[PDB]
Design a protein around this ligand. Structure first.
Ligand SMILES: OC[C@H]1O[C@H](O[C@H]2[C@H](O)[C@@H](O)[C@@H](O)O[C@@H]2CO)[C@H](O)[C@@H](O)[C@@H]1O
Ligand SMILES: OC[C@H]1O[C@H](O[C@H]2[C@H](O)[C@@H](O)[C@@H](O)O[C@@H]2CO)[C@H](O)[C@@H](O)[C@@H]1O
Ligand SMILES: OC[C@H]1O[C@H](O[C@H]2[C@H](O)[C@@H](O)[C@@H](O)O[C@@H]2CO)[C@H](O)[C@@H](O)[C@@H]1O
Ligand SMILES: [Cl-]
Ligand SMILES: [Zn+2]
Ligand SMILES: [Zn+2]
Ligand SMILES: [Zn+2]
Lengths: 370, 370, 370
């Protein structure tokens, strides 16, 4: 069971957990309630297992996409903010945390992938994806690579796949068609083909995960990377003269990244819902609260209006927001996990050569649909 | 008819329309709703013509004085903010936008006139009006004039007229007597006589309008001007070492400027009232929203408390406030258009010599009353 | 009777009254309502006398401890803020201003006592009280004293008393036992004994009041002092290189200061309750309002969320919080005046030698209980 009188919080490792722990400490000082901040491996998979039994954390942090499915699975409590608190945040962020006409999580920040480049190694970043092979030929001679990013999570190769015309589920007449999946189309195929051609032409490596790509960029080995705001902290630590810009185009089309909204959900099994509400509304969703988390690892474009001016003029944030506009806010619909798992398998097998782009993407399309 | 699915905004040319257009752009990004910002000539006269037919803008920007009349004419929608949003603004600003117990517009900023002077040509501005003729003589020798302001709008002449006793309508027992007008009294007569004597003693020119004065002050031709916050932008551009101070006194009495509250009204014929509400409450009446507009042309003392410490410590603002406090917030009552037209005619004819101060002001008093 | 149409405010002589007067001036400039700010001697005693008759101030400022008693005496109006305004402040601060399920005052700031030391005289301030006598011997050689604080108010000698075991009233099962008083226990006795031993060993003076101490610290005569945020202003004026730190430990136990919340109450006899509400909610409890008061004399840790960041990163404030966390927020229960009066007598008589620590504290325990 979940311990009453205290608060357990689960948040991802790539995020500002130590910052969030300080907020929890600040909350314990005023209230005398212990706040434990954990970062379990594979928490997005782990949570729905434990929550079903009545165990797990009091509060769950993840991007809105996994939230609709949890709500459908009857794992999330219905959040009850008054119009006063709701007005403190951007309505579009509230739309992201709504499932079945109910508010299921608290929106924290809008996170988007951006083109991060070494200003010293590359003063002018490429406007197109197409010019990247030529650019790596130049850098390879200098024992450096043009670009490196996570090829183990579909979230990173997604703005490329979507740039042309690749898509998750079709949105028409105010709803998503769960049977209409666009991970098999000409646009999706062209996108992933280009990526596999890069690996094939010794421009990228299929094995490249989150860490390896970060190490390479932060150590100056690679001139470019694809990542979100959270990454910026370690890039600062590395003292690399870096710029955060708009992602490269593909077939004259802008890259369309899947935009996530960091959200905080309350476990329906929690006997500490009112405390969870108090911590989220009065301690985290405050300018002091976000400052603490943002100083650890950057949140991106925050949902809290009162904290806009403090980040609104950072070019990194402006560049993130440009990509956000070029991309699309992810659906929260329960089918998203099925979609992600299907694309994860498709990208991995195509990159490794285990399956053809065409065969793998075809399987994904079937697997993503019910 | 008014186009549904989009917003049309009318605002005065002296205000920050390009700044407001950026807010509209920011609103289109998040919502996908086009926001057109227009600045028609004579919009305060133009709006009630078009609104009566069912056409015109979705949102109208003007000072609160014209709003009560529009509301009575059945042209303005009743604004519906929740106590949460209402608390974000100064209650006195809300009082200005209330007509017949209904909130008929959104208060933006408190605007008052100040005496703006060239620090190089005049290091010590006159405390009194009575000392401007002598000061003008000294400056004429140096090929310059002491003071120049718009003599075509009674707004700029009113602080002098109201100084020793002029008034629009008598306020007693919580209401205005529409039959009791004070544009004819000894104080109103003394005030306008002094102004006409200045023109008569070649210290001012009856022809001088807003731009003639703007040019003369910004080009260094005149040592003083009478204007509002909106003007400051062009004075900055001109690189004139300027100070914004308290208006001169007349007969030891302070100048009494008619204080205006820039307000945003929703056209009752608009099929986009909910969008208009969303734009005004969530996009403009925000620290980011006001910043955008204020950076184009200064708003004055804003109605939004959260924004105050960003303009509060500006000495120009302190002077706008000194003047505002010495003056009186304009009534919104319908007979304000009638009053303004009557005084405009009175000021013009007295300045031009076409009519005597006494004859013109007597006519005004009759014309202003029903 | 209380004058109708104008506000009268009473606030303590050690607080930022001139700052508060500026807020009142700002309120008069927008509303045309005169705001008189007074600081009467012994106002916490004076108010309940005059309020009972129907006279006194419109608004009373004091720490929350005296308010519960005033409310019971039927002197305070029930404050009516909407959830929107209530959310602008920390809920724990609202708990302090609640008596009998009614909100009886507005919470302004959290004030606690800290150890203030001369960095030039003392580079590393003592971590324990036990090392103070030895410290003093060294400073006497340099013609200085180690520590000086007000021995005329139990508020300053209370962190020492409470440290090893002292307490006002026992809190169990969500309520205070008014018959169970802990001013007589082993911990309370040890604490006050140590203080009397300091006076006895010519390390402190029984006569020392607030000003005697303020002067000695600010003139460089004493290396240490015990005071609250309000004091900082004059220490700045004195140009003494000072640090604000955690209070010394006693028997390895932290000093437990009785934490106060500066609160604003509305006199139940006032005919200006709505004006009082408007001034408190829209003028003082704003970032501009607390800036004004704070600039005069520092408030401490404010209840208003939006202003936190301005004072949050001040090390003096961090030390105020550090100590407050070690201490306990005072009860507001009507027996509090009975407690303070009883302890005041006990401390005075023990210090002066008039009574033994044991005899005086025993009398206090009886006197504090009903
Ligand atoms: O890649 C599958 C995965 O994509 C997204 O995950 C992101 C997350 O949103 C980011 O903020 C950061 O944590 O990195 C992850 C990618 O490694 C979806 O939100 C997630 O549900 C999905 O399964
Ligand atoms: O002059 C008559 C006029 O006075 C005010 O108009 C002001 C307006 O308030 C300002 O925003 C600025 O733009 O200058 C105008 C002066 O031309 C009243 O608001 C108005 O209704 C009245 O006609
Ligand atoms: O010492 C007895 C006294 O302590 C507290 O008073 C504090 C007050 O809270 C502060 O605002 C500051 O001015 O100093 C006071 C000490 O004089 C209690 O709040 C008070 O009721 C009590 O009598
Ligand atoms: Cl705010
Ligand atoms: Zn800004
Ligand atoms: Zn300020
Ligand atoms: Zn901060």
């Amino acid at each position: 069971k979940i311990e009453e009188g205290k608060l357990v919080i689960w948040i991802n490792g790539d995020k500002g957990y130590n910052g969030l722990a300080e907020v929890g400490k600040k909350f314990e000082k005023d209230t005398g309630i212990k706040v434990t901040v954990e970062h379990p491996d594979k928490l997005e998979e782990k949570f729905p297992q434990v929550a079903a039994t009545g165990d797990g954390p009091d509060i769950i942090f993840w991007a809105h996409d996994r939230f609709g499915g949890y709500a459908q699975s009857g794992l999330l409590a219905e959040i009850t903010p008054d119009k006063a608190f709701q007005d403190k945040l951007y309505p579009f962020t509230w739309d992201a945390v709504r499932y079945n006409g109910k508010l299921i999580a608290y929106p924290i920040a809008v996170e988007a992938l951006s083109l991060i480049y070494n200003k010293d190694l590359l003063p002018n970043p490429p406007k197109t994806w197409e010019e990247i092979p030529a650019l790596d030929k130049e850098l390879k001679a200098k024992g450096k690579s043009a670009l490196m990013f996570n090829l183990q999570e579909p979230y990173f190769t997604w703005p490329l796949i979507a740039a042309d015309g690749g898509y998750a589920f079709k949105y028409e007449n105010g709803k998503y068609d769960i049977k209409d999946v666009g991970v098999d189309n000409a646009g999706a195929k062209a996108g992933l083909t280009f990526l596999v051609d890069l690996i094939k032409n010794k421009h990228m490596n299929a094995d490249t995960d989150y860490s390896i790509a970060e190490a390479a960029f932060n150590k100056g080995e690679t001139a470019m990377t694809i990542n979100g705001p959270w990454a910026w902290s370690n890039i600062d630590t590395s003292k690399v003269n870096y710029g955060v810009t708009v992602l490269p185009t593909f077939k004259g089309q802008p890259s369309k990244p899947f935009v996530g909204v960091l959200s905080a959900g309350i476990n329906a099994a929690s006997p500490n819902k009112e405390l969870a509400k108090e911590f989220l509304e009065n301690y985290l969703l405050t300018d002091e609260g976000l400052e603490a988390v943002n100083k650890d690892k950057p949140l991106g474009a925050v949902a809290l209006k009162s904290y806009e001016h403090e980040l609104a003029h950072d070019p990194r944030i402006a560049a993130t927001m440009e990509n956000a506009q070029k991309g699309e806010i992810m659906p929260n619909i329960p089918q998203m996990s099925a979609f992600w798992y299907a694309v994860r398998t498709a990208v991995i097998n195509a990159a490794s050569g285990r399956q053809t782009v065409d065969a793998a993407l075809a399987a994904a399309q079937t697997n993503a649909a019910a």
